[PDB]
Paper text:
Two crystal structures of recombinant Geobacillus stearothermophilus 6-phosphogluconate dehydrogenase (Gs6PDH) in complex with the substrate 6-­phosphogluconate have been determined at medium resolution. Gs6PDH shares significant sequence identity and structural similarity with the enzymes from Lactococcus lactis, sheep liver and the protozoan parasite Trypanosoma brucei, for which a range of structures have previously been reported. Comparisons indicate that amino-acid sequence conservation is more pronounced in the two domains that contribute to the architecture of the active site, namely the N-terminal and C-terminal domains, compared with the central domain, which is primarily involved in the subunit–subunit associations required to form a stable dimer. The high degree of structural similarity, efficient level of expression and straightforward crystallization conditions mean that Gs6PDH may prove to be an appropriate model system for structure-based inhibitor design targeting the enzyme from Trypanosoma species.
Two isomorphous crystal structures were determined. Data set I was obtained from a sample grown in the presence of 6PG and NADP+ and data set II was obtained from crystals grown in the presence of R5P and NADP+. In neither structure was there electron density that could be attributed to NADP+. However, structure II contained only 6PG, not R5P, and then only in one active site with a reduced occupancy of 0.7. This value was assigned following several rounds of refinement testing different levels of occupancy to elucidate that which gave clean difference density maps and thermal parameters consistent with the amino-acid side chains in the vicinity of the ligand. We have no definitive explanation of why we only see partially ordered 6PG in one active site of structure II, although we note a difference in the time that elapsed between crystal growth and cryo-freezing. The crystals used to generate data set II were frozen after a period of two months. The only significant difference is that structure II only has 6PG in a single active site and at a reduced occupancy. The overlay of 467 Cα positions of structure I subunit A on subunit B results in an r.m.s.d. of 0.53 Å; for structure II an r.m.s.d. of 0.70 Å is observed from the overlay of 470 Cα atoms. The overlay of the structure I and structure II dimers, 935 Cα atoms, gives an r.m.s.d. of 0.29 Å.
Numbering used by the authors:
A (entry chain A): 0 to 469
B (entry chain B): -1 to 469
Write the structure that this text describes.
């Protein structure tokens, strides 16, 4: 009559190891399983001293958990997650809860949820953010699925999640795939933030001639202000590190080929699906692809001419402040877009997303965490129906004040040949969004000209077609 | 006796399939038509009086009416209706028969159907058709992919009905499986970019120089006589001559700035994300349509968000006009470079051996992006077939070196005046990123290793490294 463990974890790459370890440290007993035995062996070596046990079949695994079973899945997304669910189905019992903590496409979560639902099994797709250090110490947990199912797993999520000022970085997101959706958008925003930081860095490096020491001082100083954040903090730290053999800074030793997981494009791809403008995050993804084409770039550099550029001799302090402001405004524009995407998705899929609550859980644990997120919550506190963050009085006052600096950074980059794709797309967004009559009147005329696609009029209701060819 | 075996059949009698039908018949081919909804066949037959077109009224009758090997053109609604139709054909077809899908189809569905049908010994050609309704009647661009042996059988028909430029039909065998529908998609993507770029030129002239309909028209007419010569510039010049009868305003000034798009518009951008290719200009153009569709939000925001408080323009007018023109051309170059590098990436991924010069060649006529521009692309690949990027070609390299200063001036002026130029701005950014040997992705890679141990490579050593950033 075996003695029953509180939670099961299948999948033992580092993310699942570190989360099982987190869970145990909060006083829960854990059983674990891995298709490959050697990973379970290695985890049990590392895990000695902890209330964690190993199992070597799915029969054993399911049979070692107390009912209603709580199974956390942390296997590779796609077929391997699906193959593990198929393995589980014969042995699960009505009422058991499978939690997919993988980086899963939300529409897979939608399907699994329905498929398991008809069998009487609850499915929670949850995003987990923070990297390895987060998983171990305090991730952001972004769960969606059946509300009643969530309530059973909520105390564990709240136990292991990061806390900001006494408040858990987790909340019920919405039904079916809403959690994995928010996790996707979080990963989009992250790509965005890193690109805009890179631009700020590249500008300082090439306009001001800044070396690693001075760059660190600028970013360290920025992190004590409104830009206070994990990414800017780690950025300022990265510029202090010295490679161990050349004597140069390590960051200058690193090859400028930005990797990215295959999940990095999803936010942009779903934005296209929904009809929401996501220029900054999308440019950031394309910026990574362009950087990956290193060989093409080094070859290109030798034949394609840039502009003639006498050395910069504006005010050094003013320019640093212009970059800082450009970055904050551009970041605001990016989140304004990202939060608009989540709204659109909530409408499409009937999720009733609570945007202040979402901003609240991005506040700690996750990679994009930043003080800034407090003002986003404040925004949705004031108007839960807010259609765009730029309209909230705090962000509106910031963009009207910092727009001159973004304008200057974009104009200056253009003339000096510094690529600032995200900053420039942020400025084009701001000017498009605030403009009541854009040049799409021409585009529509064209489309009716060659395609008979019909148009609408400013002065009367109706659908109109012109015989353009005289 | 004997139902008079026809050379080709067409299923689907919307204006496109009807016009393709009539095009084919006018070239001396006999055509059998069918349509699930009966009244469309009836109507078409009274439209086609005296022409060698016969109606048939069941898939069975339709199939029995055709010469072997059978050649069947599908012009029906994308998705389920197309698969429904193929599924009804299957029992009646034979080893060697040829089903051609001519819709604006997603290339992966073609790939699936191609192999599904190859299993039964039936060939499948997924082919793009561009030019609109008038173009399908008079001479479209045709972009077939599928089995070569099957393409050789229908090639003569495609070549007869296609547009010709300088004696060359705007049609070629693009490659295997979904190759043809892929190229059509990229055609579509490129179109979106071009329209956005010309919209931006218009807005710049409109707002910076306060130009009205009439002078915009003179400027776009002047531009059509030079290197920008193209169907889209041409129709743009004509559009600005139109007057609304009721209001007496330029028609264009009375049209709601809310750009529609087919669900197909986004595909090129989504695919670029799949392949890992930078496609910023066309993607910004799709997002610009989405933005324009949010008209109500925009007018709301316009009452609330302030732009810069900038003085009216006092620079040289002729200079600014030529700067816009040049920025527009260089931007266009950058979009095409991006779109052609996508096709190259695709060709490599799906093993298609695409001929980029032949593709530019079939975009010279029939299609919407048709311009003398396309000749210079053709020439670049005829020079270097494995050219990795069109920017590296002698002709295009000379333009961008001479025009980049217009683009920069335009981007800098747009920024300072608060006039949005998403396409042209991203063109510049791409150009400046492409030609730059060391990008700030070294920081990005440091960041990723710092928080998720994703590892990095280095400039000096030839290995794979991970630092413990907390020591
Ligand atoms: O913590 C999270 O939210 C993710 O699980 C984590 O993995 C990271 O955010 C990116 O997904 C890394 O992806 P790249 O290495 O491709 O940047």
């Amino acid at each position: 009559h075996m003695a029953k463990h509180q939670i099961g974890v299948i999948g033992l790459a580092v993310m699942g190891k570190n989360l099982a370890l987190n869970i145990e440290s909060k006083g829960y007993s854990v059983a674990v399983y891995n298709r490959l035995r050697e990973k379970t062996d290695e985890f049990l070596q590392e895990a000695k001293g902890k209330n964690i046990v190993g199992t070597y079949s799915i029969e054993e695994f399911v049979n070692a958990l107390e009912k209603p079973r709580k199974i956390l899945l942390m296997v590779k997304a796609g077929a391997p997650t699906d193959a593990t669910i198929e393995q589980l189905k014969p042995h699960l019992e009505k009422g058991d809860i499978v939690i997919d903590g993988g980086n899963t496409y939300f529409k897979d979560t939608q399907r699994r949820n329905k498929e398991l639902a008809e069998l009487g099994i609850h499915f929670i797709g949850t995003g987990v953010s923070g990297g390895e250090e987060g998983a171990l110490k305090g991730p952001s947990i972004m769960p969606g699925g059946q509300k009643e199912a969530h309530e059973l797993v909520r105390p564990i999520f709240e136990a292991i999640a990061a806390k900001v000022d006494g408040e858990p970085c987790t909340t019920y997101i919405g039904p079916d795939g809403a959690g994995h959706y928010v996790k996707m958008v979080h990963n989009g925003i992250e790509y965005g933030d890193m690109q805009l930081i890179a631009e700020a860095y590249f500008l300082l490096k090439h306009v001001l001639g800044m070396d690693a020491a001075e760059l660190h001082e600028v970013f360290a100083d920025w992190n004590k202000g409104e830009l206070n954040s994990y990414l800017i903090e780690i950025t300022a730290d990265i510029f202090t590190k010295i490679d161990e053999e050349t004597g140069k800074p390590l960051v200058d030793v690193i090859l400028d080929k930005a990797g990215q997981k295959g999940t990095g494009k999803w936010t942009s791809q779903n934005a296209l699906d929904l009809g929401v403008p996501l220029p900054i995050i999308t440019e950031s993804v394309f910026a990574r692809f362009l950087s990956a084409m290193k060989d093409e770039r080094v070859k290109a550099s030798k034949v394609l001419a840039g502009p003639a550029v006498k050395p910069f001799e504006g005010d050094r302090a003013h320019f640093i402040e212009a970059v800082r402001r450009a970055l904050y405004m551009s970041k605001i524009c990016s989140y304004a877009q990202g939060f608009a995407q989540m709204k659109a998705a909530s409408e499409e899929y009937n999720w009733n997303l609570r945007y202040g609550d979402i901003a609240m859980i991005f506040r700690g644990g996750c990679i994009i965490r930043a003080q800034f997120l407090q003002k986003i919550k404040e925004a949705y506190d004031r108007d839960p129906a807010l259609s765009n963050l730029l309209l909230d009085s705090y962000f509106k006052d910031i963009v009207e004040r910092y727009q001159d600096a973004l304008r200057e950074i974009v104009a200056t980059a253009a003339m000096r040949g510094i690529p600032v794709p995200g900053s420039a797309s942020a400025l084009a967004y701001y000017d498009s969004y605030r403009t009541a009559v854009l040049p799409a009147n021409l585009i529509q005329a064209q489309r009716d000209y060659f395609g008979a696609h019909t148009y609408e009029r400013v002065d009367k209701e109706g659908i109109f077609h012109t015989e353009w060819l005289k």
